Design a protein around this ligand. Sequence first.
Ligand SMILES: CC(=O)S[C@@H]1CC2=CC(=O)CC[C@]2(C)[C@H]2CC[C@@]3(C)[C@@H](CC[C@@]34CCC(=O)O4)[C@H]12
Length: 249
Amino acid sequence: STISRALTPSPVMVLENIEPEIVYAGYDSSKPDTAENLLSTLNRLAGKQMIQVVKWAKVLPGFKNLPLEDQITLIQYSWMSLLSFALSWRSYKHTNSQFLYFAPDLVFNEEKMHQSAMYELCQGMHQISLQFVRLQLTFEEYTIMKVLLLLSTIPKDGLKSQAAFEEMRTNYIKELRKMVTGQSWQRFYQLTKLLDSMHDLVSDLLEFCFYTFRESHALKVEFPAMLVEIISDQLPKVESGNAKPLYFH
Ligand SMILES: CC(=O)S[C@@H]1CC2=CC(=O)CC[C@]2(C)[C@H]2CC[C@@]3(C)[C@@H](CC[C@@]34CCC(=O)O4)[C@H]12
């Protein structure tokens, strides 16, 4: 047992091992970069990324101590935070925050950001990547923060297993605290601040997403079944005031 306990990978080590492989957009560079084409491509990429999110959630420590309804809830609430945060990370790691690195076959410069018709939302996410450069964010801090985003929104009256969620959330907050190890406190607070700031960015991304979804026929913006499922459930929940964002500050 002493050997067993000592060799057991730390939660952070597991997070590295389970991090999904970077996914391809299947961006069709032969179609013109109209807003309609780009947004439909982003939605298709979102579908493929959500496949990976679910797989990663299956094997996420603490996350299976949670009832199936709570797991589904948290993913539906936070999928946008997870995917936009991962975007900021890939942009930071693969292009030194020069570009928005959606996929290896789909990298946005300024021109694409304008063409997508969500220029300001792209800017918001790029700004997060530029903060990654200011902070020199580490993969370790990144993976923990991403789990904290998964646990950043709950039903206004709580989850089916509120105590286990609370326990799991505190453990990852602890993991973050241990990982940032005067200078220690300041980094931790800068990271908690960045996480908080994701709620406002994500509310704006969701607002655009929900709008585009409800008008997808007029807009000619396609959504894959994966996204149709998530948004169809999430939209009326979020709009009935059933979502509660958790803030550090
Ligand atoms: C600048 C951003 O943060 S894009 C945002 C995050 C993201 C990162 C990826 O890597 C994969 C692609 C996603 C998940 C986008 C998919 C498309 C989303 C949902 C967009 C916000 C608004 C939009 C555009 C069309 C629509 O109907 O809603 C998502």
